[PDB]
Amino acid sequence: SGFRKMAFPSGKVEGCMVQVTCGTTTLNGLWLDDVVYCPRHVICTSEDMLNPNYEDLLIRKSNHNFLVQAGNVQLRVIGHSMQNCVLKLKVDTANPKTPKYKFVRIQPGQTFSVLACYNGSPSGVYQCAMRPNFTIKGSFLNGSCGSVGFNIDYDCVSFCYMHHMELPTGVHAGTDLEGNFYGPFVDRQTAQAAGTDTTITVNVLAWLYAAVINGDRWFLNRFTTTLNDFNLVAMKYNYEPLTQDHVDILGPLSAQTGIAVLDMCASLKELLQNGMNGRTILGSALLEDEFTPFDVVRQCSGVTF
Amino acid sequence: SGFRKMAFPSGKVEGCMVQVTCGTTTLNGLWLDDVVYCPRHVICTSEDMLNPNYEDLLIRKSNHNFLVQAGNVQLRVIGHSMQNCVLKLKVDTANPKTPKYKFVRIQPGQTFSVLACYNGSPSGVYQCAMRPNFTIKGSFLNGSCGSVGFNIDYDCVSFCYMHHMELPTGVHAGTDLEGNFYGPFVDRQTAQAAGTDTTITVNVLAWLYAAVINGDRWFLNRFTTTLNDFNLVAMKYNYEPLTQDHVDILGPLSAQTGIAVLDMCASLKELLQNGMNGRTILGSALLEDEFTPFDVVRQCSGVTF
């Protein structure tokens, strides 16, 4: 029993982190097989970031201008190319610690672990969600760029995020490992405002199921609702609309607990309208939306890697 | 910017986890050099746990009755001994992945990372505090016993916790790696009640400093207080007494922010008396007490391992 915001074990990804330096800029790279992936703004000064022309800045760069260090050992760069907002540095040595891996582009509401790194060295690991406005609320200092987000399926790492930018509002933006930003963000130091950070309703319901499984049941009420009724209330509280696809995904948690998804929706509606009245659920005074239904099943069933 | 509940990177500890089976009981062990450390209740059935005589149960056990598996490879047990509430299984192979390590017995209020494991395989990593009543609020299912808690200092793992018991109230108890329980708990399935779970005041103040460093400043007020005044209010809200030793530990965060420790105490006193009024600090609706002053400095300065 107990329920914790849990990250994936980080060792498979620790084995892939390297340091990339171009001129005076140092950040992190991801070494898989004989390629190192890093943010293309490794080639920029802070001055360049105000209005960078990446193709033009890259013309002035050769393989030998990209310094890649793995532990305290220097890798030889034998090619480089830009793909969207990432650089791919081809090295002459395959990473011997390369795990089974995939590159995945996640949906808003999906969760992942971040291995925060500086100078190619791991600092810490924590669990993130992709917000509905395509930001993440991370913990990233200068030099964290190139840190990655991932999920593990037994022995296979699905890389879904690479860190590129802090917005002026202190939330975080980045790319998939093909270098496409999540959301409308660009790798330029310019006015970029996030849209509405809505609550991930299907994740809140999953976490309420987690709370019931763990004996935190005070919030269960006598009511039910319909998807349309529930959604009118959700929209008012800046919660994402719940779809039948979400109801279907919550089916196994419904089955375990014997609480119909719409009954849990009616419990959530009352919590939105009445608040917590100074009470907690799974030690939280807010409704938690950083656990997917898959996360809750996984943690409640003790799945290993 | 941003501030997250962050675990240490887990790879150095992943390299040490093994499966230990005695008869029908399987749980986790920690393989360091040529010793595997595990809970002595590996030798108990659920029936035995009602009133176990560990010396008597151990007489019936030989080296060959302890099955130790590291990945899918079987280790040879060449000796066994009981130290307090842990077994030490001597194996004929030193773990090749043994990190630099120490065994430390932590104080209440100190934080650590847990690598939750089942059948010797990592499931997840999360950050814990040792509560003032010597419990932890973890996420542990049947078969998680022998999972460990740790801190890292650059390349050195300080092991501070091994998981043994879930209390009837669903909080967790365990030992240091010399097998001494934290608190008065025993490895028997009997009535064990935790004392008052007080709030770790020095950690709350550290986290308020973290909030200021990150621009969450609404709760800063016009007041100061004294240690004695503050403590009268703390005692009323089941907060731990703040000592001059705690004030001294918060000195560097005081210096960074320019907020005197007693001024922050007066901000905290007003938050206790007035509540949050539906506002949040670093995305929390509760005052967070799972970050030590060392944690806050570490995360705010980007320390790596």
PDB file of N, CA, C and O in Angstrom, chain A residues 59-126:
ATOM      1  N   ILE A  59      27.012  26.421 -41.015  1.00  0.00           N
ATOM      2  CA  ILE A  59      27.993  26.450 -42.149  1.00  0.00           C
ATOM      3  C   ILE A  59      29.422  26.601 -41.608  1.00  0.00           C
ATOM      4  O   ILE A  59      30.316  26.035 -42.196  1.00  0.00           O
ATOM      5  N   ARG A  60      29.578  27.286 -40.488  1.00  0.00           N
ATOM      6  CA  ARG A  60      30.882  27.703 -39.926  1.00  0.00           C
ATOM      7  C   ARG A  60      31.394  26.573 -39.034  1.00  0.00           C
ATOM      8  O   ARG A  60      32.436  26.763 -38.415  1.00  0.00           O
ATOM      9  N   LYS A  61      30.645  25.468 -38.919  1.00  0.00           N
ATOM     10  CA  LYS A  61      30.978  24.384 -37.956  1.00  0.00           C
ATOM     11  C   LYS A  61      31.431  23.135 -38.706  1.00  0.00           C
ATOM     12  O   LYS A  61      30.768  22.686 -39.655  1.00  0.00           O
ATOM     13  N   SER A  62      32.526  22.539 -38.231  1.00  0.00           N
ATOM     14  CA  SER A  62      33.042  21.251 -38.746  1.00  0.00           C
ATOM     15  C   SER A  62      32.888  20.193 -37.656  1.00  0.00           C
ATOM     16  O   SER A  62      32.686  20.583 -36.503  1.00  0.00           O
ATOM     17  N   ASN A  63      33.080  18.936 -38.021  1.00  0.00           N
ATOM     18  CA  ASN A  63      33.035  17.828 -37.034  1.00  0.00           C
ATOM     19  C   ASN A  63      33.904  18.163 -35.815  1.00  0.00           C
ATOM     20  O   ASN A  63      33.500  17.890 -34.663  1.00  0.00           O
ATOM     21  N   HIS A  64      35.132  18.639 -36.026  1.00  0.00           N
ATOM     22  CA  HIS A  64      36.100  18.837 -34.919  1.00  0.00           C
ATOM     23  C   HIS A  64      35.687  19.977 -33.987  1.00  0.00           C
ATOM     24  O   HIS A  64      36.321  20.097 -32.926  1.00  0.00           O
ATOM     25  N   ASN A  65      34.665  20.781 -34.326  1.00  0.00           N
ATOM     26  CA  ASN A  65      34.192  21.888 -33.467  1.00  0.00           C
ATOM     27  C   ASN A  65      33.173  21.340 -32.463  1.00  0.00           C
ATOM     28  O   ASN A  65      32.869  22.082 -31.537  1.00  0.00           O
ATOM     29  N   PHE A  66      32.705  20.099 -32.623  1.00  0.00           N
ATOM     30  CA  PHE A  66      31.754  19.491 -31.663  1.00  0.00           C
ATOM     31  C   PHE A  66      32.518  18.578 -30.710  1.00  0.00           C
ATOM     32  O   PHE A  66      32.916  17.501 -31.119  1.00  0.00           O
ATOM     33  N   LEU A  67      32.675  18.996 -29.463  1.00  0.00           N
ATOM     34  CA  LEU A  67      33.450  18.237 -28.465  1.00  0.00           C
ATOM     35  C   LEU A  67      32.455  17.398 -27.664  1.00  0.00           C
ATOM     36  O   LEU A  67      31.571  17.973 -26.970  1.00  0.00           O
ATOM     37  N   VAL A  68      32.624  16.103 -27.750  1.00  0.00           N
ATOM     38  CA  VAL A  68      31.734  15.115 -27.084  1.00  0.00           C
ATOM     39  C   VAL A  68      32.567  14.319 -26.106  1.00  0.00           C
ATOM     40  O   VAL A  68      33.560  13.712 -26.533  1.00  0.00           O
ATOM     41  N   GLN A  69      32.150  14.331 -24.840  1.00  0.00           N
ATOM     42  CA  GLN A  69      32.868  13.629 -23.767  1.00  0.00           C
ATOM     43  C   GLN A  69      31.892  12.690 -23.066  1.00  0.00           C
ATOM     44  O   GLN A  69      30.787  13.106 -22.667  1.00  0.00           O
ATOM     45  N   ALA A  70      32.316  11.457 -22.891  1.00  0.00           N
ATOM     46  CA  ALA A  70      31.504  10.386 -22.289  1.00  0.00           C
ATOM     47  C   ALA A  70      32.274   9.931 -21.064  1.00  0.00           C
ATOM     48  O   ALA A  70      33.374   9.385 -21.224  1.00  0.00           O
ATOM     49  N   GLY A  71      31.758  10.234 -19.879  1.00  0.00           N
ATOM     50  CA  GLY A  71      32.607  10.157 -18.684  1.00  0.00           C
ATOM     51  C   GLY A  71      33.764  11.116 -18.871  1.00  0.00           C
ATOM     52  O   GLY A  71      33.534  12.293 -19.225  1.00  0.00           O
ATOM     53  N   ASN A  72      34.986  10.655 -18.703  1.00  0.00           N
ATOM     54  CA  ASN A  72      36.138  11.561 -18.882  1.00  0.00           C
ATOM     55  C   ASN A  72      36.876  11.146 -20.146  1.00  0.00           C
ATOM     56  O   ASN A  72      38.044  11.472 -20.226  1.00  0.00           O
ATOM     57  N   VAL A  73      36.183  10.481 -21.081  1.00  0.00           N
ATOM     58  CA  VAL A  73      36.758  10.004 -22.374  1.00  0.00           C
ATOM     59  C   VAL A  73      36.109  10.733 -23.564  1.00  0.00           C
ATOM     60  O   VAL A  73      34.889  10.717 -23.708  1.00  0.00           O
ATOM     61  N   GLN A  74      36.957  11.265 -24.442  1.00  0.00           N
ATOM     62  CA  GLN A  74      36.577  12.067 -25.619  1.00  0.00           C
ATOM     63  C   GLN A  74      36.157  11.188 -26.797  1.00  0.00           C
ATOM     64  O   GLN A  74      36.887  10.224 -27.141  1.00  0.00           O
ATOM     65  N   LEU A  75      34.989  11.456 -27.378  1.00  0.00           N
ATOM     66  CA  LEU A  75      34.518  10.699 -28.563  1.00  0.00           C
ATOM     67  C   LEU A  75      34.934  11.432 -29.832  1.00  0.00           C
ATOM     68  O   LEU A  75      34.951  12.667 -29.842  1.00  0.00           O
ATOM     69  N   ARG A  76      35.232  10.672 -30.875  1.00  0.00           N
ATOM     70  CA  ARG A  76      35.609  11.243 -32.195  1.00  0.00           C
ATOM     71  C   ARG A  76      34.359  11.433 -33.049  1.00  0.00           C
ATOM     72  O   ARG A  76      33.655  10.440 -33.299  1.00  0.00           O
ATOM     73  N   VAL A  77      34.132  12.666 -33.464  1.00  0.00           N
ATOM     74  CA  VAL A  77      32.984  13.073 -34.316  1.00  0.00           C
ATOM     75  C   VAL A  77      33.406  12.931 -35.771  1.00  0.00           C
ATOM     76  O   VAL A  77      34.331  13.642 -36.216  1.00  0.00           O
ATOM     77  N   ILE A  78      32.693  12.078 -36.482  1.00  0.00           N
ATOM     78  CA  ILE A  78      32.978  11.771 -37.916  1.00  0.00           C
ATOM     79  C   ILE A  78      31.865  12.246 -38.847  1.00  0.00           C
ATOM     80  O   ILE A  78      32.026  12.057 -40.085  1.00  0.00           O
ATOM     81  N   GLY A  79      30.793  12.864 -38.336  1.00  0.00           N
ATOM     82  CA  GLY A  79      29.783  13.513 -39.190  1.00  0.00           C
ATOM     83  C   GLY A  79      28.829  14.312 -38.360  1.00  0.00           C
ATOM     84  O   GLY A  79      28.755  14.038 -37.165  1.00  0.00           O
ATOM     85  N   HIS A  80      28.113  15.243 -38.966  1.00  0.00           N
ATOM     86  CA  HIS A  80      27.058  15.977 -38.238  1.00  0.00           C
ATOM     87  C   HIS A  80      25.951  16.381 -39.201  1.00  0.00           C
ATOM     88  O   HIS A  80      26.206  16.671 -40.398  1.00  0.00           O
ATOM     89  N   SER A  81      24.736  16.397 -38.690  1.00  0.00           N
ATOM     90  CA  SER A  81      23.602  16.860 -39.511  1.00  0.00           C
ATOM     91  C   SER A  81      22.559  17.456 -38.583  1.00  0.00           C
ATOM     92  O   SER A  81      22.566  17.097 -37.373  1.00  0.00           O
ATOM     93  N   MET A  82      21.740  18.352 -39.125  1.00  0.00           N
ATOM     94  CA  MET A  82      20.635  18.959 -38.373  1.00  0.00           C
ATOM     95  C   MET A  82      19.337  18.305 -38.817  1.00  0.00           C
ATOM     96  O   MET A  82      19.083  18.200 -40.037  1.00  0.00           O
ATOM     97  N   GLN A  83      18.560  17.831 -37.868  1.00  0.00           N
ATOM     98  CA  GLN A  83      17.217  17.310 -38.156  1.00  0.00           C
ATOM     99  C   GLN A  83      16.254  18.131 -37.306  1.00  0.00           C
ATOM    100  O   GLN A  83      16.240  17.978 -36.080  1.00  0.00           O
ATOM    101  N   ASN A  84      15.457  18.961 -37.954  1.00  0.00           N
ATOM    102  CA  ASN A  84      14.528  19.861 -37.242  1.00  0.00           C
ATOM    103  C   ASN A  84      15.354  20.642 -36.225  1.00  0.00           C
ATOM    104  O   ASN A  84      16.367  21.269 -36.625  1.00  0.00           O
ATOM    105  N   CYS A  85      15.053  20.533 -34.927  1.00  0.00           N
ATOM    106  CA  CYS A  85      15.762  21.305 -33.892  1.00  0.00           C
ATOM    107  C   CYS A  85      16.824  20.491 -33.144  1.00  0.00           C
ATOM    108  O   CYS A  85      17.348  21.014 -32.168  1.00  0.00           O
ATOM    109  N   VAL A  86      17.174  19.298 -33.611  1.00  0.00           N
ATOM    110  CA  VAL A  86      18.307  18.555 -32.999  1.00  0.00           C
ATOM    111  C   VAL A  86      19.470  18.441 -33.958  1.00  0.00           C
ATOM    112  O   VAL A  86      19.294  18.456 -35.213  1.00  0.00           O
ATOM    113  N   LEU A  87      20.656  18.396 -33.366  1.00  0.00           N
ATOM    114  CA  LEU A  87      21.832  17.900 -34.094  1.00  0.00           C
ATOM    115  C   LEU A  87      22.044  16.426 -33.820  1.00  0.00           C
ATOM    116  O   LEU A  87      21.860  15.972 -32.711  1.00  0.00           O
ATOM    117  N   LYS A  88      22.482  15.728 -34.858  1.00  0.00           N
ATOM    118  CA  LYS A  88      22.936  14.325 -34.834  1.00  0.00           C
ATOM    119  C   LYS A  88      24.423  14.308 -35.113  1.00  0.00           C
ATOM    120  O   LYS A  88      24.819  14.647 -36.264  1.00  0.00           O
ATOM    121  N   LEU A  89      25.202  13.965 -34.114  1.00  0.00           N
ATOM    122  CA  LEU A  89      26.670  13.893 -34.263  1.00  0.00           C
ATOM    123  C   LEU A  89      27.013  12.419 -34.406  1.00  0.00           C
ATOM    124  O   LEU A  89      26.833  11.642 -33.481  1.00  0.00           O
ATOM    125  N   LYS A  90      27.545  12.039 -35.561  1.00  0.00           N
ATOM    126  CA  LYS A  90      27.972  10.663 -35.761  1.00  0.00           C
ATOM    127  C   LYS A  90      29.359  10.521 -35.125  1.00  0.00           C
ATOM    128  O   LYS A  90      30.229  11.380 -35.359  1.00  0.00           O
ATOM    129  N   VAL A  91      29.523   9.508 -34.299  1.00  0.00           N
ATOM    130  CA  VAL A  91      30.822   9.260 -33.617  1.00  0.00           C
ATOM    131  C   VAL A  91      31.381   7.941 -34.128  1.00  0.00           C
ATOM    132  O   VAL A  91      30.633   7.181 -34.759  1.00  0.00           O
ATOM    133  N   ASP A  92      32.654   7.662 -33.852  1.00  0.00           N
ATOM    134  CA  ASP A  92      33.264   6.452 -34.452  1.00  0.00           C
ATOM    135  C   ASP A  92      33.106   5.241 -33.542  1.00  0.00           C
ATOM    136  O   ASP A  92      33.623   4.159 -33.894  1.00  0.00           O
ATOM    137  N   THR A  93      32.447   5.390 -32.397  1.00  0.00           N
ATOM    138  CA  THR A  93      32.256   4.306 -31.417  1.00  0.00           C
ATOM    139  C   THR A  93      30.770   4.202 -31.086  1.00  0.00           C
ATOM    140  O   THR A  93      30.145   5.219 -30.724  1.00  0.00           O
ATOM    141  N   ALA A  94      30.223   3.012 -31.227  1.00  0.00           N
ATOM    142  CA  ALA A  94      28.860   2.718 -30.772  1.00  0.00           C
ATOM    143  C   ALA A  94      28.879   2.739 -29.249  1.00  0.00           C
ATOM    144  O   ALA A  94      29.803   2.154 -28.629  1.00  0.00           O
ATOM    145  N   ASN A  95      27.853   3.338 -28.626  1.00  0.00           N
ATOM    146  CA  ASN A  95      27.789   3.317 -27.158  1.00  0.00           C
ATOM    147  C   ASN A  95      27.625   1.875 -26.714  1.00  0.00           C
ATOM    148  O   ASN A  95      26.606   1.255 -27.010  1.00  0.00           O
ATOM    149  N   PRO A  96      28.569   1.318 -25.938  1.00  0.00           N
ATOM    150  CA  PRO A  96      28.432  -0.060 -25.491  1.00  0.00           C
ATOM    151  C   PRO A  96      27.259  -0.306 -24.538  1.00  0.00           C
ATOM    152  O   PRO A  96      26.883  -1.441 -24.362  1.00  0.00           O
ATOM    153  N   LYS A  97      26.703   0.753 -23.947  1.00  0.00           N
ATOM    154  CA  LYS A  97      25.609   0.698 -22.968  1.00  0.00           C
ATOM    155  C   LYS A  97      24.286   1.006 -23.678  1.00  0.00           C
ATOM    156  O   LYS A  97      23.276   1.161 -22.966  1.00  0.00           O
ATOM    157  N   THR A  98      24.246   1.056 -25.002  1.00  0.00           N
ATOM    158  CA  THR A  98      22.989   1.382 -25.728  1.00  0.00           C
ATOM    159  C   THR A  98      21.934   0.370 -25.275  1.00  0.00           C
ATOM    160  O   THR A  98      22.093  -0.839 -25.486  1.00  0.00           O
ATOM    161  N   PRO A  99      20.806   0.815 -24.705  1.00  0.00           N
ATOM    162  CA  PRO A  99      19.701  -0.096 -24.443  1.00  0.00           C
ATOM    163  C   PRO A  99      18.880  -0.313 -25.695  1.00  0.00           C
ATOM    164  O   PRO A  99      18.994   0.420 -26.668  1.00  0.00           O
ATOM    165  N   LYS A 100      17.994  -1.307 -25.633  1.00  0.00           N
ATOM    166  CA  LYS A 100      16.868  -1.342 -26.579  1.00  0.00           C
ATOM    167  C   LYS A 100      16.143  -0.008 -26.435  1.00  0.00           C
ATOM    168  O   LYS A 100      15.923   0.422 -25.289  1.00  0.00           O
ATOM    169  N   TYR A 101      15.763   0.588 -27.544  1.00  0.00           N
ATOM    170  CA  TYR A 101      15.127   1.920 -27.517  1.00  0.00           C
ATOM    171  C   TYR A 101      14.243   2.155 -28.728  1.00  0.00           C
ATOM    172  O   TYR A 101      14.447   1.570 -29.819  1.00  0.00           O
ATOM    173  N   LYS A 102      13.371   3.146 -28.541  1.00  0.00           N
ATOM    174  CA  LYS A 102      12.511   3.719 -29.578  1.00  0.00           C
ATOM    175  C   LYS A 102      12.430   5.225 -29.350  1.00  0.00           C
ATOM    176  O   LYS A 102      12.568   5.667 -28.192  1.00  0.00           O
ATOM    177  N   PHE A 103      12.128   5.935 -30.416  1.00  0.00           N
ATOM    178  CA  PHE A 103      11.748   7.362 -30.347  1.00  0.00           C
ATOM    179  C   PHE A 103      10.237   7.466 -30.518  1.00  0.00           C
ATOM    180  O   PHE A 103       9.688   6.906 -31.493  1.00  0.00           O
ATOM    181  N   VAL A 104       9.574   8.041 -29.534  1.00  0.00           N
ATOM    182  CA  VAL A 104       8.101   8.185 -29.570  1.00  0.00           C
ATOM    183  C   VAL A 104       7.732   9.655 -29.377  1.00  0.00           C
ATOM    184  O   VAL A 104       8.408  10.371 -28.621  1.00  0.00           O
ATOM    185  N   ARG A 105       6.679  10.073 -30.060  1.00  0.00           N
ATOM    186  CA  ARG A 105       6.099  11.409 -29.874  1.00  0.00           C
ATOM    187  C   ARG A 105       4.836  11.219 -29.050  1.00  0.00           C
ATOM    188  O   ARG A 105       3.889  10.552 -29.544  1.00  0.00           O
ATOM    189  N   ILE A 106       4.845  11.769 -27.839  1.00  0.00           N
ATOM    190  CA  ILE A 106       3.731  11.524 -26.883  1.00  0.00           C
ATOM    191  C   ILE A 106       2.604  12.527 -27.140  1.00  0.00           C
ATOM    192  O   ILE A 106       2.789  13.542 -27.827  1.00  0.00           O
ATOM    193  N   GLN A 107       1.444  12.185 -26.588  1.00  0.00           N
ATOM    194  CA  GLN A 107       0.211  13.003 -26.575  1.00  0.00           C
ATOM    195  C   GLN A 107       0.188  13.865 -25.318  1.00  0.00           C
ATOM    196  O   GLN A 107       0.717  13.499 -24.272  1.00  0.00           O
ATOM    197  N   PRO A 108      -0.480  15.029 -25.336  1.00  0.00           N
ATOM    198  CA  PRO A 108      -0.726  15.766 -24.099  1.00  0.00           C
ATOM    199  C   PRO A 108      -1.414  14.860 -23.082  1.00  0.00           C
ATOM    200  O   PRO A 108      -2.297  14.078 -23.461  1.00  0.00           O
ATOM    201  N   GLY A 109      -0.996  14.957 -21.827  1.00  0.00           N
ATOM    202  CA  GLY A 109      -1.585  14.162 -20.743  1.00  0.00           C
ATOM    203  C   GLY A 109      -0.735  12.950 -20.439  1.00  0.00           C
ATOM    204  O   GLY A 109      -0.874  12.367 -19.341  1.00  0.00           O
ATOM    205  N   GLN A 110       0.142  12.547 -21.355  1.00  0.00           N
ATOM    206  CA  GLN A 110       1.028  11.380 -21.125  1.00  0.00           C
ATOM    207  C   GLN A 110       2.171  11.788 -20.190  1.00  0.00           C
ATOM    208  O   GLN A 110       2.621  12.924 -20.237  1.00  0.00           O
ATOM    209  N   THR A 111       2.604  10.866 -19.348  1.00  0.00           N
ATOM    210  CA  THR A 111       3.635  11.116 -18.328  1.00  0.00           C
ATOM    211  C   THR A 111       4.928  10.464 -18.773  1.00  0.00           C
ATOM    212  O   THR A 111       4.930   9.569 -19.632  1.00  0.00           O
ATOM    213  N   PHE A 112       5.995  10.912 -18.164  1.00  0.00           N
ATOM    214  CA  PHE A 112       7.331  10.360 -18.466  1.00  0.00           C
ATOM    215  C   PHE A 112       8.269  10.775 -17.362  1.00  0.00           C
ATOM    216  O   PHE A 112       7.999  11.728 -16.597  1.00  0.00           O
ATOM    217  N   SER A 113       9.425  10.105 -17.299  1.00  0.00           N
ATOM    218  CA  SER A 113      10.467  10.454 -16.316  1.00  0.00           C
ATOM    219  C   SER A 113      11.487  11.346 -17.005  1.00  0.00           C
ATOM    220  O   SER A 113      11.779  11.093 -18.184  1.00  0.00           O
ATOM    221  N   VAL A 114      12.024  12.310 -16.269  1.00  0.00           N
ATOM    222  CA  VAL A 114      13.134  13.179 -16.735  1.00  0.00           C
ATOM    223  C   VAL A 114      14.365  12.833 -15.922  1.00  0.00           C
ATOM    224  O   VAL A 114      14.313  12.826 -14.691  1.00  0.00           O
ATOM    225  N   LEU A 115      15.479  12.646 -16.613  1.00  0.00           N
ATOM    226  CA  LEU A 115      16.804  12.515 -15.976  1.00  0.00           C
ATOM    227  C   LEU A 115      17.493  13.851 -16.152  1.00  0.00           C
ATOM    228  O   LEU A 115      18.023  14.121 -17.241  1.00  0.00           O
ATOM    229  N   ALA A 116      17.403  14.707 -15.158  1.00  0.00           N
ATOM    230  CA  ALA A 116      18.041  16.038 -15.197  1.00  0.00           C
ATOM    231  C   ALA A 116      19.547  15.850 -15.135  1.00  0.00           C
ATOM    232  O   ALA A 116      20.017  15.131 -14.256  1.00  0.00           O
ATOM    233  N   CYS A 117      20.267  16.429 -16.094  1.00  0.00           N
ATOM    234  CA  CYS A 117      21.724  16.301 -16.235  1.00  0.00           C
ATOM    235  C   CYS A 117      22.356  17.661 -16.434  1.00  0.00           C
ATOM    236  O   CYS A 117      21.732  18.534 -17.027  1.00  0.00           O
ATOM    237  N   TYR A 118      23.599  17.781 -15.979  1.00  0.00           N
ATOM    238  CA  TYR A 118      24.501  18.932 -16.221  1.00  0.00           C
ATOM    239  C   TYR A 118      25.873  18.392 -16.586  1.00  0.00           C
ATOM    240  O   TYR A 118      26.342  17.464 -15.926  1.00  0.00           O
ATOM    241  N   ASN A 119      26.463  18.961 -17.650  1.00  0.00           N
ATOM    242  CA  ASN A 119      27.825  18.561 -18.093  1.00  0.00           C
ATOM    243  C   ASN A 119      27.852  17.053 -18.361  1.00  0.00           C
ATOM    244  O   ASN A 119      28.887  16.366 -18.083  1.00  0.00           O
ATOM    245  N   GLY A 120      26.748  16.475 -18.857  1.00  0.00           N
ATOM    246  CA  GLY A 120      26.709  15.043 -19.159  1.00  0.00           C
ATOM    247  C   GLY A 120      26.541  14.135 -17.949  1.00  0.00           C
ATOM    248  O   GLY A 120      26.632  12.934 -18.145  1.00  0.00           O
ATOM    249  N   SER A 121      26.343  14.672 -16.742  1.00  0.00           N
ATOM    250  CA  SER A 121      26.279  13.891 -15.486  1.00  0.00           C
ATOM    251  C   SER A 121      24.894  14.026 -14.868  1.00  0.00           C
ATOM    252  O   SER A 121      24.312  15.099 -14.839  1.00  0.00           O
ATOM    253  N   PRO A 122      24.298  12.886 -14.472  1.00  0.00           N
ATOM    254  CA  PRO A 122      22.962  12.907 -13.865  1.00  0.00           C
ATOM    255  C   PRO A 122      22.917  13.605 -12.501  1.00  0.00           C
ATOM    256  O   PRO A 122      23.796  13.451 -11.631  1.00  0.00           O
ATOM    257  N   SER A 123      21.895  14.412 -12.328  1.00  0.00           N
ATOM    258  CA  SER A 123      21.651  15.172 -11.095  1.00  0.00           C
ATOM    259  C   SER A 123      20.485  14.514 -10.374  1.00  0.00           C
ATOM    260  O   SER A 123      20.537  14.409  -9.185  1.00  0.00           O
ATOM    261  N   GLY A 124      19.453  14.106 -11.094  1.00  0.00           N
ATOM    262  CA  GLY A 124      18.236  13.641 -10.414  1.00  0.00           C
ATOM    263  C   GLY A 124      17.226  13.132 -11.390  1.00  0.00           C
ATOM    264  O   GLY A 124      17.381  13.375 -12.598  1.00  0.00           O
ATOM    265  N   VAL A 125      16.250  12.400 -10.898  1.00  0.00           N
ATOM    266  CA  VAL A 125      15.175  11.879 -11.760  1.00  0.00           C
ATOM    267  C   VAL A 125      13.822  12.225 -11.152  1.00  0.00           C
ATOM    268  O   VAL A 125      13.623  12.098  -9.904  1.00  0.00           O
ATOM    269  N   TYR A 126      12.886  12.611 -12.001  1.00  0.00           N
ATOM    270  CA  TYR A 126      11.526  12.955 -11.515  1.00  0.00           C
ATOM    271  C   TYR A 126      10.527  12.649 -12.626  1.00  0.00           C
ATOM    272  O   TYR A 126      10.849  12.571 -13.809  1.00  0.00           O
TER     273      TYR A 126
END
